[PDB]
Amino acid sequence: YQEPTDPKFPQQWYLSGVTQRDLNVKAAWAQGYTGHGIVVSILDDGIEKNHPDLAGNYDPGASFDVNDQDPDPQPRYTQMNDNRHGTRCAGEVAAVANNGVCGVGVAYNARIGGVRMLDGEVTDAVEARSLGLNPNHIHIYSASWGPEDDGKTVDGPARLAEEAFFRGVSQGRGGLGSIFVWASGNGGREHDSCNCDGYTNSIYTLSISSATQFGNVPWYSEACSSTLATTYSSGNQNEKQIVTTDLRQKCTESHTGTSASAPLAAGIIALTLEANKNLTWRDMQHLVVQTSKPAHLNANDWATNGVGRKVSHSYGYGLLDAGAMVALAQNWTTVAPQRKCIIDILTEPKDIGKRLEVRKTVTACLGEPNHITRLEHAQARLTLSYNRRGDLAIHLVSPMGTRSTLLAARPHDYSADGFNDWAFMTTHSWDEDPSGEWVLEIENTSEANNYGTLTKFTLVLYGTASGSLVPR
Ligand SMILES: *[C@@H]1O[C@H](CO)[C@@H](O)[C@H](O)[C@H]1NC(C)=O
Ligand SMILES: NC1=NCc2ccccc21
Ligand SMILES: NC1=NCc2ccccc21
Ligand SMILES: NC1=NCc2ccccc21
Ligand SMILES: [Ca+2]
Ligand SMILES: [Ca+2]
Ligand SMILES: [Ca+2]
Ligand SMILES: [Cl-]
Ligand code: NA
Ligand code: NA
Ligand code: NA
Ligand code: NA
Numbered sequence: 103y104q105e106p107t108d109p110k111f112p113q114q115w116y117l118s119g120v121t122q123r124d125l126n127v128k129a130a131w132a133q134g135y136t137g138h139g140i141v142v143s144i145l146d147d148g149i150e151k152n153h154p155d156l157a158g159n160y161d162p163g164a165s166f167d168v169n170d171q172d173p174d175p176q177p178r179y180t181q182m183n184d185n186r187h188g189t190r191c192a193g194e195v196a197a198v199a200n201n202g203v204c205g206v207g208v209a210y211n212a213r214i215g216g217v218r219m220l221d222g223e224v225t226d227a228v229e230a231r232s233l234g235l236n237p238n239h240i241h242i243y244s245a246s247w248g249p250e251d252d253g254k255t256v257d258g259p260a261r262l263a264e265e266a267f268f269r270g271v272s273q274g275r276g277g278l279g280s281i282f283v284w285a286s287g288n289g290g291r292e293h294d295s296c297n298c299d300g301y302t303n304s305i306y307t308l309s310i311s312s313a314t315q316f317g318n319v320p321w322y323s324e325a326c327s328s329t330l331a332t333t334y335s336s337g338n339q340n341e342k343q344i345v346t347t348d349l350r351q352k353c354t355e356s357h358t359g360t361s362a363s364a365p366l367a368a369g370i371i372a373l374t375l376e377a378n379k380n381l382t383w384r385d386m387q388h389l390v391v392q393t394s395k396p397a398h399l400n401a402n403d404w405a406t407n408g409v410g411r412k413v414s415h416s417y418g419y420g421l422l423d424a425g426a427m428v429a430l431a432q433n434w435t436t437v438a439p440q441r442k443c444i445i446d447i448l449t450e451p452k453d454i455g456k457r458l459e460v461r462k463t464v465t466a467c468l469g470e471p472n473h474i475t476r477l478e479h480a481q482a483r484l485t486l487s488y489n490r491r492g493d494l495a496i497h498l499v500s501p502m503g504t505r506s507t508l509l510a511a512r513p514h515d516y517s518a519d520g521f522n523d524w525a526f527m528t529t530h531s532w533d534e535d536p537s538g539e540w541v542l543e544i545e546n547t548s549e550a551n552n553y554g555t556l557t558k559f560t561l562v563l564y565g566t567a568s569g570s571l572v573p574r
Pocket of ligand 6: 198
């Protein structure tokens with residue numbers, strides 16, 4: 103195998119690195135996987151389809167302009183170059199290789215499109231028509247947007263967008279399911295907690311966080327239990343950043359944030375789908391859980407779960423490993439159909455006060471078709487009132503002892519509106535047996551005399567009842 107000759111490929115340290123601090127993408131390229139036959143769409147502010155490093159891979163069938171209702175996602179050019187982001191993301195996935203221009207995409211032989219949908223009023227309908235674009239042609243969608251990262255918002259997809267997720271994973275891609283790759287958020291400076299973002303907190307999105315070049319949690323990172331894995335992005339001014347295509351037919355070395363991590367993940371997922379086109383949306387999440395690598399990512403919260411995998415709320419299961427993903431995909435056996443076990447926990451409302459603990463021993467639908475012995479996602483769907491929402495911290499402990507932070511204190515969240523059946527999600531108990539005692543902890547982290555009531559706690563388990571590996 104001959105590595106790319108593009109002039110900025112040596113600057114693509116997160117691909118071309120020879121020091122083991124990279125996404126192990128050359129190993130997938132050398133196995134023969136470059137994205138041939140896979141179609142990725144960037145849902146953002148448009149795509150410069152004539153960019154010299156994108157035109158060769160551009161796919162109009164992966165593209166649309168939802169803001170102006172036309173097929174052409176070309177960005178709106180302004181003095182401030184406001185609408186450059188989708189072009190930057192597109193080049194991360196699928197910039198052309200070996201053409202003397204800028205660098206390369208992770209999946210540099212994949213086809214790449216863009217939906218122009220952020221440059222206007224972004225309604226539920228706009229989101230839904232974007233997520234649902236051409237779902238039997240587009241394989242993978244990448245989205246680096248969502249509710250405001252102000253550290254005080256709790257919001258998620260409204261009805262049309264949630265319907266789009268369900269239709270995408272159910273009937274999209276020939277019934278295998280659209281793969282929705284999501285950036286987990288950029289609200290770190292505001293102490294944001296990403297389970298308060300219903301797009302990344304969804305089980306239907308494959309949520310990705312960032313690590314800096316030196317292996318640290320960047321300033322902009324949000325921790326939460328819904329994140330699945332990590333790719334490199336930007337950090338401090340001594341650390342390099344992401345190198346990609348830019349607006350006006352240029353090349354940038356300064357693409358940043360979790361917004362740059364999701365496209366890199368989408369590219370790795372494209373290589374993986376080339377290696378096994380029959381993978382379902384759930385298979386892909388299993389592959390990420392099994393192959394991602396904690397090594398040399400620094401965090402104070404690495405914990406071993408019940409099947410011996412290390413997990414962090416900053417990083418999920420760790421860095422994506424493209425070579426390991428494509429290798430494991432090739433002979434992967436499709437997972438069994440998804441089961442859903444609904445357990446309504448409370449028999450009475452519970453005062454929260456300073457601290458509340460709810461313990462319940464469950465059988466996980468023993469004796470029923472939805473019996474789960476192998477967990478995938480778990481949710482604690484909570485309905486509660488509280489006088490100052492951001493003083494709450496919430497944890498969920500699985501029977502195997504895995505402590506998931508469902509909500510960390512958010513100092514800017516002064517809301518008195520509480521949570522209305524909010525489905526806090528954790529990936530940290532993946533492959534555990536969920537039978538046994540679960541513990542929900544709700545704590546007032548402030549010295550104030552705060553008050554409220556938990557009125558509903560539904561534990562929702564997803565998973566199967568067959569096919570476990572020996573614990574790591
Ligand atoms: C895809 O997987 C399904 C489920 O295991 C199987 O029935 C089908 O034959 C597979 N198709 C291909 C082309 O491998
Ligand atoms: N998940 C996200 N919510 C807001 C946002 C901005 C940029 C990238 C990701 C997100
Ligand atoms: N769903 C959304 N809330 C705020 C926002 C900004 C941009 C795109 C989508 C959203
Ligand atoms: N998916 C949905 N979000 C809100 C809602 C109301 C009624 C039916 C479906 C939905
Ligand atoms: Ca247009
Ligand atoms: Ca190039
Ligand atoms: Ca956020
Ligand atoms: Cl469901
Ligand atoms: Na919403
Ligand atoms: Na998600
Ligand atoms: Na443990
Ligand atoms: Na058990």
